[PDB]
Design a protein around this ligand. Structure first.
Ligand SMILES: N[C@@H](CCC(=O)N[C@@H](CS)C(=O)NCC(=O)O)C(=O)O
Lengths: 209, 195
């Protein structure tokens, strides 16, 4: 149809979850990366970032900014936002937890090394004692293939993405969570997901800058 | 009909934008205040806090945590989430900006208020001239904006000076029946909670 246009840096950052979500829906997208501060300025001065911030995604004729507005729109567009408002309630709740933990991990490489260590022991604690139990349970509470409504939703993709970053951050943390482990392989082998895990894709590595 | 039951500290904090949204929808709600560290532990152990955190709202026989999930649900149940995906994208975009500025409230946020966020929302109101931000109908984000404008006034009523459309907007939404009721003394609306 039309190709969405991701305006971000050449990094994971706040844009990766949208790349993932677009990828899982089988939606090809292009990116204009931002390397020069003038690019960001040329975007600001041209009236493209409502709050003068990236991420920003051109899609169906909008200059959508703010991560969550992007993710919600894409998810509704390609029926990754569930069946009804009660399922979106489960989806939003799950996604927001996933976001909290992700934010905690990606920010460890940013904080003062003053506190790297204890904030690291925090993320690991939260990973193993709060968030992973919470989603291991959800899979065990209903014993189904997906998080919500027994069919693929945006939050399955979010969780897989998080499971990938947990493994990077510390692969040991996953071993006491069997369903998530089964869930990870299940979702990883969905066609559009497998395609995105493949080398050469728009998927982004952990940056060092 | 069971009232939504809001589980939070007796404070503004992360629960206030929900109190606002319920009140602007004219929905009566009840509050169970976490008073003791023992109160929160027995919410966790009863299995009511999926991520061991509040805000938690009991609504329609389920226990919702995560503010955005709570707000999204309420806004959808009561037709404050706009009319289609494209209005939700405006509503989400506006709300998430409003949520960021609210978050910031040295005192750096005066600049962002005056030079980034408030110009953005005056321009929204300039663009279509209509009474509400989105779809020429009251939506949740009108209520979030009014809420932001109230806290900006508390922060520094001089930041509202240059923004005549926001000003009329504030007064205009303040005077909605359901809104006026929540602004009245004696409502569940919360103060800035000091210490
Ligand atoms: N993203 C969550 C954050 C919730 C949150 O930070 N809750 C605090 C209360 S204001 C809490 O229960 N903290 C206890 C803890 O984190 O251990 C939301 O928006 O609801």
């Amino acid at each position: 149809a039309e190709k969405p246009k991701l305006h971000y840096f050449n990094a994971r950052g706040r844009m990766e979850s949208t790349r993932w979500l677009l990828a899982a829906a089988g939606v090809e997208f292009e990116e204009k990366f931002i390397k020069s501060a003038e690019d960001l300025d040329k975007l600001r001065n041209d009236g493209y970032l409502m709050f003068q911030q990236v991420p920003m995604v051109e899609i169906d004729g909008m200059k959508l900014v703010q991560t969550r507005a992007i993710l919600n729109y894409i998810a509704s567009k390609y029926n990754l936002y569930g069946k009804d408002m009660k399922e979106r309630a489960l989806i939003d709740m799950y996604s927001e937890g996933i976001l909290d933990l992700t934010e905690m991990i990606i920010q460890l490489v940013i904080c003062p090394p003053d506190q790297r260590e204890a904030k690291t022991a925090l993320a690991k604690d939260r990973t193993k004692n709060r968030y992973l139990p919470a989603f291991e349970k959800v899979l065990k509470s209903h014993g189904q293939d997906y998080l919500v409504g027994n069919r693929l939703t945006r939050v399955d993709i979010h969780l897989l993405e998080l499971l990938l970053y947990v493994e990077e951050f510390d692969a040991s943390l996953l071993t006491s969570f069997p369903l998530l482990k089964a869930f990870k392989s299940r979702i990883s082998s969905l066609p559009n997901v497998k395609k995105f895990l493949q080398p050469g894709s728009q998927r982004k590595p952990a940056m060092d800058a």
